[PDB]
Amino acid sequence: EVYGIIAMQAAYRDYDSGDAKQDDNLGGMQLNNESRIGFRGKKQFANFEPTFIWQIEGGYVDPSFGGEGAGLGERDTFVGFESASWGQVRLGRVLTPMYELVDWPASNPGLGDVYDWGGAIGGAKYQDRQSNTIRWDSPMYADKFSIDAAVGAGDKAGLGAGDDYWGGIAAHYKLGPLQLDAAYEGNRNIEAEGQTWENNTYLVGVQGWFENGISFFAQYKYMEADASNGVNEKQDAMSAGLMYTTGDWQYKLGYAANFDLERDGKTLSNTSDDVVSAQIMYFVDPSAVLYARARMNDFNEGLDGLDDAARWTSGTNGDYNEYSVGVEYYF
Amino acid sequence: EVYGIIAMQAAYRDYDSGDAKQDDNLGGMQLNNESRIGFRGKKQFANFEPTFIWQIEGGYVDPSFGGEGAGLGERDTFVGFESASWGQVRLGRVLTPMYELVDWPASNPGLGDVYDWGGAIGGAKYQDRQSNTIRWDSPMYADKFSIDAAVGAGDKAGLGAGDDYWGGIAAHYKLGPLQLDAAYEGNRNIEAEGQTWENNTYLVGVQGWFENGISFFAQYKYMEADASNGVNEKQDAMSAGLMYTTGDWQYKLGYAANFDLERDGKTLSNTSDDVVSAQIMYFVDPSAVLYARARMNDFNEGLDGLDDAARWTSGTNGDYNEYSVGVEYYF
Amino acid sequence: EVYGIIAMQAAYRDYDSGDAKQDDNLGGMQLNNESRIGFRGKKQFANFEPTFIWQIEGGYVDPSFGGEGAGLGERDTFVGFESASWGQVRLGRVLTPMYELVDWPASNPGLGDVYDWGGAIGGAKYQDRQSNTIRWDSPMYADKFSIDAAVGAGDKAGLGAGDDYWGGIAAHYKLGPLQLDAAYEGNRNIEAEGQTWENNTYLVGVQGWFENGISFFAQYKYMEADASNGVNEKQDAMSAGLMYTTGDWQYKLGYAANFDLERDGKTLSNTSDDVVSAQIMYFVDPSAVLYARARMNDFNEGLDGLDDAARWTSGTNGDYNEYSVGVEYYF
Amino acid sequence: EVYGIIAMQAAYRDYDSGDAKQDDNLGGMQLNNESRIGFRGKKQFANFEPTFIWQIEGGYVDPSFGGEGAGLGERDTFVGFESASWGQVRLGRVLTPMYELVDWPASNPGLGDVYDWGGAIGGAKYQDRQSNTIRWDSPMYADKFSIDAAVGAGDKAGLGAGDDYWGGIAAHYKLGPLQLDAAYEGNRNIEAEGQTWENNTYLVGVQGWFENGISFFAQYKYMEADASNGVNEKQDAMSAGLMYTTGDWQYKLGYAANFDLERDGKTLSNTSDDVVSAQIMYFVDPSAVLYARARMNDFNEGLDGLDDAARWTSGTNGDYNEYSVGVEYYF
Amino acid sequence: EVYGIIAMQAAYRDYDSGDAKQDDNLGGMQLNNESRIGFRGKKQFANFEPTFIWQIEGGYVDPSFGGEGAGLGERDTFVGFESASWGQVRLGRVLTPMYELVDWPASNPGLGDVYDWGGAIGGAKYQDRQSNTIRWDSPMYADKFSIDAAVGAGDKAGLGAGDDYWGGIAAHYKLGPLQLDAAYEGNRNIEAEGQTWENNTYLVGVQGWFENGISFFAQYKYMEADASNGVNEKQDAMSAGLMYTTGDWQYKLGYAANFDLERDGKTLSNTSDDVVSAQIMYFVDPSAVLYARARMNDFNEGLDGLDDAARWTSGTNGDYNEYSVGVEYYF
Amino acid sequence: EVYGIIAMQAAYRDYDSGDAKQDDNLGGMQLNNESRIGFRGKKQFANFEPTFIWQIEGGYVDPSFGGEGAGLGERDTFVGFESASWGQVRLGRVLTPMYELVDWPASNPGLGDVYDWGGAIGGAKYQDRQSNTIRWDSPMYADKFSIDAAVGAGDKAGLGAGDDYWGGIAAHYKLGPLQLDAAYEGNRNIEAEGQTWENNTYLVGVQGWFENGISFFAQYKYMEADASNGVNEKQDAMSAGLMYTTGDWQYKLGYAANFDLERDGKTLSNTSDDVVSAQIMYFVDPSAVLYARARMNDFNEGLDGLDDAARWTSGTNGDYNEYSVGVEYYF
């Protein structure tokens, strides 16, 4: 079977970097095509109760700030097995258990720049989509409880350039109308800024959907990092979202912010990021939606990494605002 | 729907560059696979009358002179809407209205090296394809008249590396067997050769198809560009093609030429290009065609761009001829 | 038609190179996803008896030691014709007649590192999947005898940087349970190490498949090469594999070895390669297999090329072992 | 040692019950004196590392709606032992682990009538203070994690009229500025409405205090109850509070509501309760506070218990509003 | 601060009721422990000029004619504030301003049965120490004049069973050795005998203390009440006491009497009460006193309340005499 | 002065009555908190040689089988005088001379159910703690001999409902290691079962304490009773306890028994009670003890009193055993 997500977003960005040439370059209107086509299937092996599953999902066709064309298998690509008793194991390229909760619902509408990759910490906060990974998903135990857990190889280790590795786990309980989310993921042997890093990171969150039409999510993310020279770093963040849905409309209000980083007990001044964004969405068909979106990004003013040299953050390009309309179609 | 254009051309090229190694390198026989797979669809959104359309077309799988593999969305990739009253808006990656007429019919068979990207002018004449584009195609008004019109972001602006942008427009009138073709396209903030350019380019052309089997096309392309230091450049060109069609055959004769370039009123001698070409085509099936073809390109001898350094042209590799057969199948 | 081959292998590698960072980088476990998706079709052109065929094969989605994503047409991608009379001629990117026999059956249980690209000879032994190629496959005449024959452009020549080329032929006679097969491939105009080479390469082998469950194969590969300054180089190699099949199981043991290289009559010390391997394979479905395998590679101790610089060989990463399980599914 | 809590609250109540005679009775102004005197001590037993501890806390001296005078040991009155390693176990009359979190912070600006005893469920949701109880408090593991756990005798069983019993547990993790609260308490052998009941009940909650002066708490209470004649009942509720604290002032907003009760799958119409309340507090001394408070109570319209007879609820007296000033002194 | 009044009175009573069973029951010797323990304090709130005050005074531990045990806060229990400028306001449970003059000095020795609660009138004459009260005491203006004034809720309204309330005022002028005392108190919404009453009560009195050792007190009490059916009742009374004090001794003679009641102008015969009493007192310590006292009580002969049923008065137990010794120690 | 006795006993009871609901209610584990707080003091009156003493003792805070809270003055509460000459006279609520010897040492461990308030005799065997009482405690004459003597009003007489009363005396001579004890107490005007009774009760006992660690007590109780209609009743009883003391431990074994009741010379069948008990006690601090104890009660089978209605005994609840640990702490 072929399956696509058609995804077009027209988006004007107004950057304030302090350099007007850079501002005019980086800013302006663009088209962010995140449409993608993939293939997936299941197959009942003649000698195996677990059902064989496989999927190859290609990448974003023409993202903004980037060129055209995407190969196959740039997104979730894997083989695996599934039995209803014990769930589903996958091997390949997937979302770590924590990254799932960081993305949804914690990065939407457009908070990603700060809650997804918006970090000031060293090492490697967590991992989003990693290609050398085993991941088991538990069933909905009692139709209420589920565990997600995964181990995999590191970014550099997947190309034979290093020995980073990682594991992570998260669980979700759905108490009636609410849902509780907790998550952990640890990285080790992370080589960066001239030292070797160990990252531990924990996430707590909640989600609810009530008949009055209000829905919400809120999350606390605690990020630690310890360097090989004995340096310690700690930074934490939050994301939460308020939405009302009436008829074929959803209004949404989102806020996310990473807070100031502490290195070796001392705090690093003005190293936090904050994002507010508003979104209206129209349920134009059971299979697609239209949306308009505006956002305000206030980014950090800098952090030297442990190498006497700067460290890159989402705010390294500078503050900006963005108004956008888009479409997303599922098939 | 999945749709392909399967397209193979075996083509021997005999280069005369002035360097025998260079001739031996660039020349010889090659296979030009222009096959492509694409995906496109329409969807009637339940709460919106204009029908949604989308298409993701992959690139040339193994071009000649190139390596293998191309992603999806390397060719026409877009989403859009269409209503019978006001036409068709598509957003993403499409062909500018002028490039449409440059490719068809003005650049085939083998007139492309000269009419398509074969320029001697500075700045950026017009655009082939380009992402970050909105394009409106008008209906066939009165079953005689049609407008094509579009604006989009520039090459560097699409990576936040500049503020190039452009707009363009074209029209078509149908007098019986004739069709009149006019088109315009202007580019702004084109950063090149150390200056900033504004390229205006104007095109008029005609097309005919007669019951006896005679068909023809002819076009005038007028190209202007102004660099930020007050320099001006102007160059003009033409392409025309004659074909008679009998039975399961079309013989064709094509000629295109860029003329000498004028910079600041002075003509820069031997900056012109011209190609002659012949092609026999057999309609081997309703769904496919075979062709044999031969062409001769004589290219310019060079011109420094406004940076005291050379300027790249389609002729920078030197004059060459090419004999080729190919197949093309549509599915 | 869509036809993927889904293939995942989890494989631990323990290297002994003499540098432990190298061991730690290069070694460890990784996920080698060799899944690939393709498109193929046939079409009867109404005005041409030979049947039209075409195929577009995508690359490996996330191989080990490599990043994610592969375009379409990275593997066997071609157009061609087929008649019961004269067989099948194809144009595009295919496998040379010899590389087919080097892959099957001679690298079967992981022996490729030594028998496939495991080379020490200079220039270019042969070609693994080459673009710009015409290749004719003969029918199975008398249902016992078949010819494979092809020529194509060289690797450097396909980018207009040279005029290297190659041709090759192989034959297969099927003496009852055995199959006797021989093959040749010659490359010309190969630029390397500061000179130009002509590589001649001959391979003979046999394979059998028996009702007892015994099946076996053995091949000898003879590789000669001559450089532009008058140097001669020769290396030879062999591969064999034994397999017993009970029920839904296959046991396999494979061995392959390149022997020491002779340059200008003088043999060069400690230049052999040898790989030993065992694998258990389970036929979990007619369309899929499970397998576990472990192998031991002993590689060369080094070789200066004719440019006084080293030559890369499969052993430039060092001796290493690997234990692995995988899955493979065909649709 | 003697210790007191001095506590005076002047409070006018405006009742709407539908009977004005009853309205004038229950309504009007009163003084709710919750002052109390207690005694506690520790003593290091000559032969015992665990420190003997004991406390006798008398009751509210003159509550509103009640007579004067209170004995000793009407509030938390107990003996127990404490070691720093494993915490402190107490025996006597204490707060169940879940009830603590209902009193604080969940019933905080005057919501108790709704979240504390504001119930519609049958049986016995949880327990206030029970004077036949063993309760263990964990240390602050890592000065971050704490477990509280207890079992005890029931209300009727403490008088030799029954065999009620109960157990409960809760935990609290302090993630930097946050605190997460979870809690459970189950009662058994509850004789009521002519049947024997089993109540299971779970609580989720969160707490934060940030430099900007914001503080908050939010809680979900899930209450189930099963009668021995096979009836099932389910009800749930929530409490949350938002407060800003500037200088010597705290503004506070609290909202709590029980939702409609479900009995045997069927919902009981208009059986929910809702309370809104606002409070200003002045930190008149490190040891005491003055406060003003106003609140709005909307109660259920009734529920028959499983005995064909009415069931008493916190709302059985009817809706009312309340404005109040008070003082509370600690010594 | 802990403060007690230790108080024991051994008192034999000889009752004359007309029934020897009642006489033998009600009479005999008894121990009247009026000891009580209290807790009280003042505190200067750091952010408030008025000084905070509070007191919790327990009840009589074993009164005569009563069971053992008394809570805390059964007597004067309150919180309040004081500044030298405007006096002292207390909130909680206190003595009404008239009751103070009724108890001291008008009811001792043993005149309470007649002057304190001994009324014969319907409704509610006044209040003996009622909770739910605010009370303001003025400074000694000009070091001669003092006013006391307070309002609070009624008895039934203090339990939400009605809406009775009351107010009252008293003043004190000090003419040399004299003090003139006047006081008023009115009660409203008094539910009794099936009607609702409004009772107003006015009191005038004087006290003197002379250098030669003579002291005296005399008071007139005027008691009104109006029932809701239009009935009116009026009764009046007096109490006076003379005492001479020499050395460590005070001899005292007390007389008090309720007079005949008038209902609707018509006086009801034999409804008066009067008591005669003598007491010798020895000052055994600055902190304590011993006393012997004998008193003789003659009570009224009865009256139906407006409910056709008899009405309870201090005399419903019948006439009696009483001889007693006691001790009183203050700490 | 403040003084406390903190006393907690965890005690499981297993009842056997002949009805298992009663067994289930009454039985089970409970927390019996017998902690109590008191206040006492002495004062030398400046004009009086006898030293003034006073005490206010509160009741048990949460007994087993009973609710929370106890007032002040439920236990020994009195005023009195003390001189070295004549000892100590106290007035108020104290323990009668006989109840002391019945409580200590004859009732513990756990023998009270049978020896203290256990009983079958009519009227009122004796009085436990009585209010309205004067009791003279004699000095220890010759440092070996002492008298205790007291009279007070009866239980019903203390509320003016009767004229029951009582007096009593006991003496103790201390012959070396032994102490010989005799005691009497008589009650009069006891109304019960429709008759008036005079109860006579005599007790003799011994006590010993040796350096060997052996200590023991034995006591015989003789109870007679005569009713107003001329009936006679007689019951007698005995208690003894043997204890050995090693180090900080005390072993104790206790037995007590009421014998069958004799009414009017005829014995009433199966009316005896006997209880046996064992306890281990640990002297964990000079002011505190830990103890475990188990005991077995076999109670009488019933007795109609002189009203043809049943008579209540300690066995009206049925036979039972009890296992328990407790704590006891002083001041």
Ligand SMILES: C[C@H]1c2cccc(O)c2C(=O)C2=C(O)[C@]3(O)C(=O)C(C(N)=O)=C(O)[C@@H](N(C)C)[C@@H]3[C@@H](O)[C@@H]21
């Ligand atoms: C030379 C090989 C090599 C050298 C050094 C490091 C490597 O990792 C490799 C490979 O893994 C190769 C392959 O796997 C091939 O894809 C490979 O194994 C292969 C195949 N599966 O048939 C090919 O035909 C090759 N390709 C598709 C054109 C290619 C090899 O050329 C290389």
Ligand code: NA
């Ligand atoms: Na831009």
Ligand code: NA
């Ligand atoms: Na899951």
Ligand code: NA
């Ligand atoms: Na590795």
Ligand code: NA
């Ligand atoms: Na058009």
Ligand code: NA
């Ligand atoms: Na073949």
Ligand code: NA
């Ligand atoms: Na705790």
Ligand code: NA
């Ligand atoms: Na009494």
Ligand code: NA
């Ligand atoms: Na006063």
Ligand code: NA
């Ligand atoms: Na009221």
